Design a binder for this molecule. Sequence first.
Ligand SMILES: [Mg+2]
Ligand SMILES: [Mg+2]
Ligand SMILES: [Mg+2]
Lengths: 319, 319, 321
Amino acid sequence: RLCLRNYPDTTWIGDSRSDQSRVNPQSLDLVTEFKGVLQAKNGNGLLKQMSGRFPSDWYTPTTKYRILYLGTNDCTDGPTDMIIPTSMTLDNAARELYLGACRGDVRVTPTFVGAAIVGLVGRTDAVTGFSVKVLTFSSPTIVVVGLNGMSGIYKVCIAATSGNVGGVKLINGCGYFNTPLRFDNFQGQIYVSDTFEVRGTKNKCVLLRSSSDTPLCSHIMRNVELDEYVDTPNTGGVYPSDGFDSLHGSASVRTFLTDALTCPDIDWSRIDAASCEYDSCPKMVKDFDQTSLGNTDTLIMREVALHKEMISKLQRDIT
Amino acid sequence: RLCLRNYPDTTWIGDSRSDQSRVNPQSLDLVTEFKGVLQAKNGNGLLKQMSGRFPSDWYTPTTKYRILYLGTNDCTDGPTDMIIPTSMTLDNAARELYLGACRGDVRVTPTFVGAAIVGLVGRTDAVTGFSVKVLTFSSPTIVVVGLNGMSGIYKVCIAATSGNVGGVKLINGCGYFNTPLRFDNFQGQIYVSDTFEVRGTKNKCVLLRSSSDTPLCSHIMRNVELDEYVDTPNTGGVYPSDGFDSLHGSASVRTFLTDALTCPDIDWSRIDAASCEYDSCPKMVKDFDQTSLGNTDTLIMREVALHKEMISKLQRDIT
Amino acid sequence: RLCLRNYPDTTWIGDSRSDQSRVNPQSLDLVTEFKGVLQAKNGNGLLKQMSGRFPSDWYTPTTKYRILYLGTNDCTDGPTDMIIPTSMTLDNAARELYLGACRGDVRVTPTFVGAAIVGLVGRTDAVTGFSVKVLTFSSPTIVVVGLNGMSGIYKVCIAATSGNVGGVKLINGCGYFNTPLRFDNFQGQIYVSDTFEVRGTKNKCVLLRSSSDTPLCSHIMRNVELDEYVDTPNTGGVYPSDGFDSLHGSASVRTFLTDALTCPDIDWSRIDAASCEYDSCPKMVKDFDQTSLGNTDTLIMREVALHKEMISKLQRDITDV
Ligand SMILES: [Mg+2]
Ligand SMILES: [Mg+2]
Ligand SMILES: [Mg+2]
């Protein structure tokens, strides 16, 4: 019997299925109260949080423990999200992000961007299809992003009319990076997301399977390789058909999560883990009820005091 | 009998009356040690933190639980703080901010600002009357602030010689916003505060009344409508006259707060709440003291030994 | 026996000797699992975090409690780190930073930089010897850093061909500042670090001595004046000679830290402190064992039952006679 840590030192990292504040209950899978911090946003994911669609909803756990239930939305990242030459693959970007949310001492901070000429700061839909901050360069220049020694991942998207990286002609679209970047002969617009910094990795999590209504993309499928991965109810890898719609509100997922979060009388303060099996979990110590011991003392006292009455009479009758 | 959660997973959000680090003790109302995180600043409030007076003192709770004791300073925001056309009302801005500090998964982050031309970044007292960060646009241009999809509140203050919002001529002063903004034909100087991001809202608080020395302004008075509101000692809504001055050090407020924070032997780990009534609060389990039960045994034993003697004596006395 | 708070509401703030995630185990001193949050980076310190060498590794504790085991690396700051006129001394900068990490409600945020002209944003090795963000000003201008009312410390480094502060000619190098700054007639390149904001100071820590392989520089030696300072194993003030090298992996430091973090059955939830002496620490309560009380009851009941038997024999042995 799985027991998940339901305690104020734990952050639940989720998507619409856990977004209790902002999603109609009919579409929730997390339908019990979570005593820790809830960071769950409809439509979001660890890659999607860098897209600019949800500019205020970055995941920023600061607790020792985490439980993750997300990933389905990250399968909308595809080839155009790793098309800038020298971009990380989505497989490797996702691995670093999921490891970071699970184990990491993480932050979200502004990414360095500069250039050999003054760029124009504005916002536009022309790079991604929705409004993000851009720098516009109206003549060709050197553009630099990130800093040597950095430890984290950021997303870049470009709409360039010229430019190369190390002599390789740029291709318009996006990419993920965990090192500094330099574009030469660059003209056009550039979006750079904040950096998801991942420093030390001694925090702890459970990673609950997030299923889609189609087979998972490779970069989220590979989360099965992490020691923290725990299966959740699914039908051949696909989200169950017992919900409100094909993607939300599964009765069996709800029962799985609720049961795992309502183990009775677990003293979470006494185990350094984001979960435990019920029989092995440390249990709360309770007040001792001494009423039954007191009843025995009374019943014995009764027979004794009546033994005293009897004895005296036997003593007199023997006189 | 009110018990407030006095525990490391709780953030106390306050003003001079709770600023134990930086205010003379004679002016404090929070005069007992708080076992959680204390974020309290002389002069500050959830609106005032955006004024530019507090560039390093924004409130940033990251804990599951909060206790708020602030608002009196926010009553110095007035008509000039909601005068930019399309600004939020102070009533609505305060409501979002107090709900955010109380229940929110919150962050404080830089607000996007851009324009159709390059302006100048500097600092001046010309916009608000005191030194803040400003952008100067000496030629009329399009100025853009915030981003579609954002979830939070920021403050804008302008000193403009031209400009309009959607064709409505701008009025100099300030406003609060929770959506992106666009000014057309803008010439002059603009201050933009950081954004108080409010994402999910499943954290928990108590909101303790903060009284002024006159009746509260409308936008703070309305905090009485929140489920978390708890009255604090007052005289017809005004701060009591039993303190160091008209605004600080009330003997009766001090006793109220100290009593509520020193309920003995509450096991806060076993209740998912920022307060409880004493009789209903979960109590710490203590080692059981068996001394009285052991004394009862010894008395019984003394008597039974006597009966053993007297019985033997009867048996022999049957000589 | 020292017991250090080993609990999820505590942040361990360290350097390579505690950087369990990223440092070879032979060079670790913290070799036991820490149940709280670990923020420890090889080569870093509370001053060095502002240098730009570790741009993603700023210390950002958000917990009520902290344990510090760092400082040796901050002795690489020297005269060139307080040479800009009006800079804080390293003694005063370190004091504010160590108090902030120990006791502070802290944040790490961007530092305001503005000017009378548009500064060119770029990155270069020319100011510090390694790559950092700089602004370049190619015309003599007014440059302003920080904001009135701020509460925190930031680092500035310059490579200027002209400029002054309040009429005092600038000197190239670095400085630490906790107030807004203004340079006049400035021309050249300027690096400005993020701000380590220190607001209220009612969080709590233990500050464990961090020893170097030579005697400590003055600005870290002075951490002994703080109430929270606790000595750690050392040989005449320098790191012991029982480690992997002269600066890491000391066998005696390891034992000191492991012993202090493995006090058995401490109920940290019942003490508002980052440490306690073992005998005084609150201990976990266990279920009460009533077996001895039950044995005493049962023994008594057996005896009283023999009395019933023998009384009846008596009560009868008399009615006969
Ligand atoms: Mg495995
Ligand atoms: Mg008994
Ligand atoms: Mg001392």
